[PDB]
Write a structure and sequence with these properties.
Two copies of one chain form a homodimer. Chain A has eleven helices and 13 strands. Chain A is of the alpha+beta class. In chain A, helix 5 links the parallel strand 4 and strand 5. In chain A, helix 4 crosses helix 5 and helix 10 packs across helix 11. At the A-B interface, helix 4, strand 5, helix 6, strand 8 and strand 9 of A face helix 4, strand 5, helix 6, strand 8 and strand 9 of B. Bound molecules: coenzyme A. Coenzyme A binds next to helix 2, helix 7, helix 8 and helix 9 of chain B. The site of coenzyme A (COA) has 21 residues of chain B, from helix 2, helix 7, helix 8 and helix 9. The PDB classes it as transferase. The entry lists the keywords Flavonoid, chalcone synthase, transferase.
């Protein structure tokens, strides 16, 4: 084998997360949003938006789009005026810059040298460019120019699971390989003024926030330097039955526009157990309540119905609900925060593993397709 | 290992290509192009465009944008009027449709069942959508809903090499895995009226054409059932020094806008030997003239200077020049055609291998970065 393969399973070797500094309280967002878009007279619409915010499960979100930025780019504050170029001017720098913030933290925890990074896997939903955010991230961090890159533009909310799936095969098939798995999201491509005829707009405006997470992934950890946090044992995905059209997203002259023509929480709840039953098997099929649950917090409804359908104890979804609460829906980056939050809860409560006492757990994303992405991890001991 | 790995190197097991039916002869293209965009008064510009066409090394190209289609979508015939929406209406269907035509041919040559495809790796430069072209192709072909997908939107011309690099790790790390490696391009997202303000555009308008290629990639071929055409032994890439901005692409309200710098052939030719010297080593560093050369035909100047710098014999670049001649630059798909052409030339001339008698060869792409992508292949014997 002309490029020698690695021996052990892929491991998460370090985690880093990052958010823009400005915070937006959900209890105050309807006034700010409808004012900055000059729609404050639309009382009935604002009341509807408030209902959505009140049901969202979100306390605050981080966003680069401050009052100053929005006043400086009025095109983004319209409903459908052509604005894609001013949108890309914001996200082309912020998306890799935020990723670099998170990547420095992940490398610090890992303990290795930046010059030993061999691969980058990068997901986003926030605009596109040539060369891509992967290339920018390599420059910002001063990586070696021979770094091997996989740039997954335009994924939607399953992309965090995607980067860990791809990193697994890259780390497992290349002796010595150390991968940066990256997901970074900035809401400037999707932001727009509220409208009575765009209800999916209303929901996105209540849910989406900014953030980035990156993991260092690698097989065969050097014992004198590297400490694995999680092992990756299985990765797969499926398209759910009769889900055509559930989530559509079109990049247009006015930015990214979503249309949701099916019951997404219902589609996932009705189908998740059959597929999760398959993922369990290669690790001996533990019971749902013997596992940890790093679930993408697309919204409170999806977390609730999965909790009920599987009869999970209330602590299982707490990691996900914490992230929803403090950061909202950061699209592909969210699930990376969730796993991190489960690790932190484990340390704070003195559990025996970094999966809150459980040995195996799920790392789950979903999005357009309707696509369900699932990985199975093993948690390290908490020493 | 909870998902068992494969044993042998990844193999190309079948090849398929496809193009839209309409043909555009290069010697007449300046008349048609300047006609249909109502630019016939720009005589000086048209003379320059003809000079480019005559030096391009291109005899004809295939394009979906026929006279009737262009007349029916007048926004695409403008310089900068907003047109991204009707452009995406074309490429969101045509890009996967073209891929499906090439994939059927590749699957027929492979001989396996479509239900045994496990993976899709998909590159393109022709717009974006959610769900992606990968999902559309899975639907059109009737693949399993559990197919694992990697969608590299917005790669530029190195993406053909990219999909094979990714396919290598996916096939080598998964026992029984059979991957569809796909690259598909349609020029409707980049086409626009010629202008004295966008001379880079003139070169793009002379070079780019439509096409798609797909390879079946897999390790461990079942003897007497599957016949490998090439083995993949090495894959790497590098960013060339001081080449920021050589190739740029931004997706805007008016479609995709490229920047192409006069230095590109020089940047590649002045650096390629140094890197290829390294890629050679894991297979024993064969001599340049003992290898075959599947090189992305970005332009005639690039092929010419690489041939000179490396002192290659005149037959080494013929495969690339054939593809340039008959199809032009089909961005990420082009190099997939080149390898297929080298196999056909081998058979036609009765060579001893499918690499025109050589044992090892390069599969080379380049694009925004400036990124150089290289794989090292071994050719099968010619029985
Ligand atoms: C385009 C190409 C065929 C030009 O042919 P050539 O043999 O170099 O001949 P010339 O230098 O006379 O070029 C012809 C004309 O194109 C112009 N031209 C070439 N490259 C240009 C560029 N990047 N931008 C603008 N004009 C360009 C020249 O200035 C010249 O104009 P002129 O007739 O008014 O002097 C050749 O330079 C080439 O293959 N370039 C690389 C293409 C490329 O970058 N690949 C696409 C993406 S990888």
């Amino acid at each position: 084998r002309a490029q020698p393969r690695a021996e052990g399973p892929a491991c998460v070797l370090g985690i880093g997360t990052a958010v823009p500094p400005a915070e937006f309280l959900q209890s105050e967002y309807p006034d700010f949003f409808f004012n900055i878009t000059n729609c404050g007279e639309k009382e009935a619409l604002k009341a509807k938006f408030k209902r959505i915010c009140d049901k969202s499960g979100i306390r605050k979100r981080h966003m680069f789009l401050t009052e100053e930025v929005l006043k400086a780019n009025p095109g983004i504050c319209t409903y459908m005026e052509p604005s894609l170029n001013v949108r890309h001017d914001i996200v082309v720098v912020q998306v890799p810059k935020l990723a670099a913030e998170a990547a420095q933290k992940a490398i610090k925890e890992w303990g290795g040298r930046k010059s030993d990074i061999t691969h980058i896997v990068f997901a986003t939903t926030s605009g596109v460019n040539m060369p891509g955010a992967d290339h920018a991230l390599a420059k910002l961090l001063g990586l070696k120019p021979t770094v091997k890159r996989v740039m997954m533009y335009q994924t939607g909310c399953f992309g965090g699971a995607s980067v860990l799936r791809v990193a697994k095969d890259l780390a497992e098939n290349n002796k010595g390989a150390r991968v940066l798995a990256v997901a970074s999201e900035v809401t400037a491509v999707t932001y727009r003024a509220p409208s009575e005829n765009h209800l999916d707009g209303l929901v996105g405006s209540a849910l989406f926030g900014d953030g980035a997470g990156v993991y260092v992934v690698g097989s065969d950890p050097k014992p004198e330097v590297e400490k694995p946090l999680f092992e990756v044992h299985w990765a797969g995905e499926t398209i759910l039955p009769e889900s055509d059209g559930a989530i559509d997203g079109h990049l247009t002259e006015a930015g990214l526009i979503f249309h949701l023509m099916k019951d997404v929480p219902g589609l996932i709840s009705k189908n998740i157990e059959k597929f999760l039953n398959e993922a369990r098997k290669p690790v001996g099929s533990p019971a749902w309540n013997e596992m940890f649950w790093a679930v993408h917090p697309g919204g409170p409804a999806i977390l609730d119905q999965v909790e009920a359908k599987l009869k999970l104890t209330k602590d299982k979804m707490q990691g996900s609900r914490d992230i929803l609460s403090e950061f909202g829906n950061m699209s592909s980056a969210s699930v990376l925060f969730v796993l991190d939050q489960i690790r932190h809860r484990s340390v704070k409560m003195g559990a025996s593993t970094l999966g809150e006492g459980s040995e195996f757990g799920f790392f789950i994303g979903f999005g357009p397709g309707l696509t369900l992405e699932v990985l199975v991890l093993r948690a390290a001991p908490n020493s």
